[PDB]
Scaffold this motif. Structure first.
Motif, PDB file in Angstrom:
ATOM      1  N   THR A  80       4.670 -94.736 -35.645  1.00  0.00           N
ATOM      2  CA  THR A  80       5.302 -94.563 -34.261  1.00  0.00           C
ATOM      3  C   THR A  80       4.915 -95.460 -33.390  1.00  0.00           C
ATOM      4  OG1 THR A  80       5.652 -92.248 -34.671  1.00  0.00           O
ATOM      5  CG2 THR A  80       6.139 -93.345 -32.449  1.00  0.00           C
ATOM      6  N   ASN A 134       7.408 -98.824 -32.162  1.00  0.00           N
ATOM      7  CA  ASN A 134       7.498 -98.666 -30.529  1.00  0.00           C
ATOM      8  C   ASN A 134       7.245-100.344 -30.233  1.00  0.00           C
ATOM      9  OD1 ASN A 134       5.985 -97.262 -27.738  1.00  0.00           O
ATOM     10  ND2 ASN A 134       8.149 -97.902 -28.064  1.00  0.00           N
ATOM     11  N   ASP A 165       9.975-103.469 -31.633  1.00  0.00           N
ATOM     12  CA  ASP A 165      11.405-103.085 -31.567  1.00  0.00           C
ATOM     13  C   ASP A 165      12.247-104.328 -31.059  1.00  0.00           C
ATOM     14  OD1 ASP A 165      10.340-103.599 -28.809  1.00  0.00           O
ATOM     15  OD2 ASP A 165      11.142-101.944 -27.868  1.00  0.00           O
ATOM     16  N   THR A 188      11.435 -93.432 -30.887  1.00  0.00           N
ATOM     17  CA  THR A 188      11.023 -94.309 -29.991  1.00  0.00           C
ATOM     18  C   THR A 188      11.710 -93.894 -28.354  1.00  0.00           C
ATOM     19  OG1 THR A 188      10.623 -96.303 -31.376  1.00  0.00           O
ATOM     20  CG2 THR A 188      11.501 -96.719 -29.052  1.00  0.00           C
TER      21      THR A 188
END
Lengths: 146, 145
Positions: free
Chosen positions: A114, A118, A121, B113
């Motif tokens: 994660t 993140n 992206d 996200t």
């Protein structure tokens, strides 16, 4: 940050015919950096057999099985770049250029994944990371992570 | 990419185990028209591959790539466990917010996200973990991008 990143765990310009080869290399580097015991390498290979660790967008995040939790000594990653790519997903175009071997304590691999996703992206950033020859540029680009 | 309304918000739930919470989340994604029944087992299977406890009281159980065609529409089920459910390996690895995700292929990544950025504020997690108001849940998560 959740994990350190530096010249000691950034490996550029690698080549592999198969994902088993890339996974083993990542596992070997996690052992060498003191993140995991040697048994974690096979756990990464076993985990891959259950379901691919390709995440889409040219990234794969191989990690150990839940049974290997106690082989992880401390949280860490190994960033491995394969400019020509390595097939990681189920289909032939499921190619990864960024193979990030993950070892989080207490089976918390998703927290490291994660953090990475993140930060990764942006299509253009992933493209620069798959081809850069500079460890310092890798560090810059992954500097926003948790 | 996810809608939120009273129908996919489950306040005041209780569960003795994370498997029970994951099954409840999966069953509600079925009931809400997001997924076919085989996706529930995919969520439990995903949990045995890569546990979904994110830390800071949140867990995000999702399916597998193999079960992508069992997803009918992308979405989540927000399940609140005010007394907590252990999702991690140690005693304090407790989830009060269990967000089950219906996503195809690796589309769960972008859902996580989005949630991760909407739940950065610790006070937002706390309010969400204990509110009895759907209105407040909707308001607290309206900043999601």
């Amino acid at each position: 940050n959740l994990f350190k990143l530096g010249a000691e765990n950034i490996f550029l310009g690698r080549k592999a015919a198969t994902k088993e080869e890339a996974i083993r290399f990542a596992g070997e580097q996690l052992v060498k950096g003191g993140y995991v015991e040697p048994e974690y390498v096979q756990a990464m290979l076993d985990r891959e057999k259950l379901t691919p660790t390709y995440l889409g967008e040219s990234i794969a995040v191989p990690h150990g099985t839940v049974e290997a939790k106690d082989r992880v000594l401390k949280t860490g990653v190994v960033f491995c770049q394969y400019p020509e790519g390595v097939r990681f997903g189920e289909e032939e175009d499921d190619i990864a250029r960024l193979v990030i071997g993950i070892a989080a304590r207490n089976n918390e691999h998703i927290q490291v994944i994660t953090s990475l996703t993140n930060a990764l992206d942006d299509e253009s950033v992933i493209e620069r990371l798959a081809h850069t020859t500079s460890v310092d540029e890798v560090l810059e680009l992954l500097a926003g992570r948790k």
